[PDB]
Amino acid sequence: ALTQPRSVSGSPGQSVTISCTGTSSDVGGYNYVSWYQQHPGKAPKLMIYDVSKRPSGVPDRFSGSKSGNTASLTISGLQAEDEADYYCSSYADSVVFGGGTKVTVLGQPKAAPSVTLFPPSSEELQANKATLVCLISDFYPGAVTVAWKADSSPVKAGVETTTPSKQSNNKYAASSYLSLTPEQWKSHKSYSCQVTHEGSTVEKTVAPT
Amino acid sequence: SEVEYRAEVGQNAYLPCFYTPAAPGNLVPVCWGKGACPVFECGNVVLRTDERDVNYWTSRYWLNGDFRKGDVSLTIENVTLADSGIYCCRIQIPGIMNDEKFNLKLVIK
Amino acid sequence: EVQLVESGGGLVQPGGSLRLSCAASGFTFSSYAMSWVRQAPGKGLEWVSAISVSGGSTYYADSVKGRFTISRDNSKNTLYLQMNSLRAEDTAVYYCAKANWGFFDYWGQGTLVTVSSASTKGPSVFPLAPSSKSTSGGTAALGCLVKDYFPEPVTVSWNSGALTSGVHTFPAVLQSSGLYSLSSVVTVPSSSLGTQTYICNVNHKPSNTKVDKKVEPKS
Structure with missing residues (x-):
């Protein structure tokens, strides 16, 4: 019943605004609209309630309005912090929520990823298994391409890579695991983890010796 | 509905609200608030009762009828133009989504 | 100072039952309506159910009506959610919140409820x-x-x-x-x-x- 844009993006200092479209029985003939902010691993935060009413602890720069059936949350003078998921809610007849809006603060400086490659432990090999652990951290924008290579040859099978998750500091972290057999690990001279970010590749290598 | 309840600035406003207890003595919780009835409870609550008596109260907003007999009508004493608007009277009939929501229009002049 | 602590989540077989608890502190629990809001992993927010200040009247989303029962113990400052006849769709993080007249100012750090025919496996x-x-x-x-x-x-x-x-x-x-x-x-x-x-x-x-x-x- 409530439709919000999937994403809104702005530069720092920009005034930005999220719309929330409902029916005349949802947002229309009632002043019962709330707005919640949600950062990564956190519970949502009440930003605005009763269309415009702002709870204590919510910055002045968050303002709530409504025209007809379209409630709007306007974030005046964006900040890096403001990079979160925003949900609108109507509570006139039932408690309904919008699809959410990903607010992207654009200005942010590029950070190249920091790669750490760990070979299989002597413990894991004694258990007839092998896992190469490639840990990628502090990168912005939050998009990477991980490519594994045995010596020179590329490896498709056994690769499992996480989607980059927004850390506390707006930067991102990802991890790729390459599952091998102890036989496959000892048969090659080396193994490489290649992370490509903003058209630049960072390679880390490990060898069975 | 075109139904209004009127008062001049200074008078007491009288907005009516009623229920019939299922049995004598069985009160149903009631709440009054400024603005139309939301999903649950009262928008900007001014008064609330439970199955025993009045649990939340505010000055000027009183239940001066026999609330024990289902007469939960409100009295807003010494009204201002600020008091104009819709008022919610929620009769919280026990159980799953059984509530009787009453929106009452108050007009101050 | 306001605190809400969800407990009771875990792994349930489809068709099974589970009881969530929420311990409230830092406010007069006796005078606020309460509700449960769930979030499927990587998905959005969905209101589950709410309870009146008195506890006498309960309200539910169509998705859970008949299967879930919200209850409160004002004497123990606790909110409960009895989830019966569970399904994979109910797999979500269940937040306990202070619902006022439809808005949630305070939320706890939710409890995860996982509904799978799969059995737990230690690492x-x-x-x-x-x-x-x-x-x-x-x-x-x-x-x-x-x-x-x-x-x-x-x-x-x-x-x-x-x-x-x-x-x-x-x-x-x-x-x-x-x-x-x-x-x-x-x-x-x-x-x-x-x-x-x-x-x-x-x-x-x-x-x-x-x-x-x-x-x-x-x-």
């Missing part, structure tokens, strides 16, 4: 032995591989919580096998190696798995 913990291969300065990176476990979550601590700085417990990978795997790394002084002992304390409550791995440098 295999392996030491990720140190080398300063990727670390600038007199720091070396070492860690723990927490392999194949189900469902989430796993908690990693270092030296029984005494080691906090430089710790990075990575978000888990959801492997094709349906099993999770994560890594926790700590960046420590290279000089301390050889004296300072480093142990990771892995806890998987869903399978009663408590593992303490000493991660030492290899030859």
Whole structure:
């Protein structure tokens, strides 16, 4: 019943605004609209309630309005912090929520990823298994391409890579695991983890010796 | 509905609200608030009762009828133009989504 | 000062039952309506149910009507959700919130409810032995591989919580096998190696798995 844009993006200092479209029985003939902010691993935060009413602890720069059936949350003078998921809610007849809006603060400086490659432990090999652990951290924008290579040859099978998750500091972290057999690990001279970010590749290598 | 309840600035406003207890003595919780009835409870609550008596109260907003007999009508004493608007009277009939929501229009002049 | 602590979530078989509790402190619980709001992993918010200030009237979303029952104990300052006839669709993080007249000002850090025909599996913990291969300065990176476990979550601590700085417990990978795997790394002084002992304390409550791995440098 409530439709919000999937994403809104702005530069720092920009005034930005999220719309929330409902029916005349949802947002229309009632002043019962709330707005919640949600950062990564956190519970949502009440930003605005009763269309415009702002709870204590919510910055002045968050303002709530409504025209007809379209409630709007306007974030005046964006900040890096403001990079979160925003949900609108109507509570006139039932408690309904919008699809959410990903607010992207654009200005942010590029950070190249920091790669750490760990070979299989002597413990894991004694258990007839092998896992190469490639840990990628502090990168912005939050998009990477991980490519594994045995010596020179590329490896498709056994690769499992996480989607980059927004850390506390707006930067991102990802991890790729390459599952091998102890036989496959000892048969090659080396193994490489290649992370490509903003058209630049960072390679880390490990060898069975 | 075109139904209004009127008062001049200074008078007491009288907005009516009623229920019939299922049995004598069985009160149903009631709440009054400024603005139309939301999903649950009262928008900007001014008064609330439970199955025993009045649990939340505010000055000027009183239940001066026999609330024990289902007469939960409100009295807003010494009204201002600020008091104009819709008022919610929620009769919280026990159980799953059984509530009787009453929106009452108050007009101050 | 306002606190809400959800308890009671875990792994239930489809068709099963589960009771969630929420302990309220920091406010007059007796005078506020309360509700439960759920969030399917990587999805949005969905209101589940609410209860009147008195406790006498309850309100539910069509998705849960008939299967879930919200209740309150004003004397114990506790909110309950009895979930019966559960389905995979009900797999979500269940937040307990202070509903006022339809809005949620205070929320707890939710409880995860996982509804799968799958059975819990404890993790295999392996030491990720140190080398300063990727670390600038007199720091070396070492860690723990927490392999194949189900469902989430796993908690990693270092030296029984005494080691906090430089710790990075990575978000888990959801492997094709349906099993999770994560890594926790700590960046420590290279000089301390050889004296300072480093142990990771892995806890998987869903399978009663408590593992303490000493991660030492290899030859």
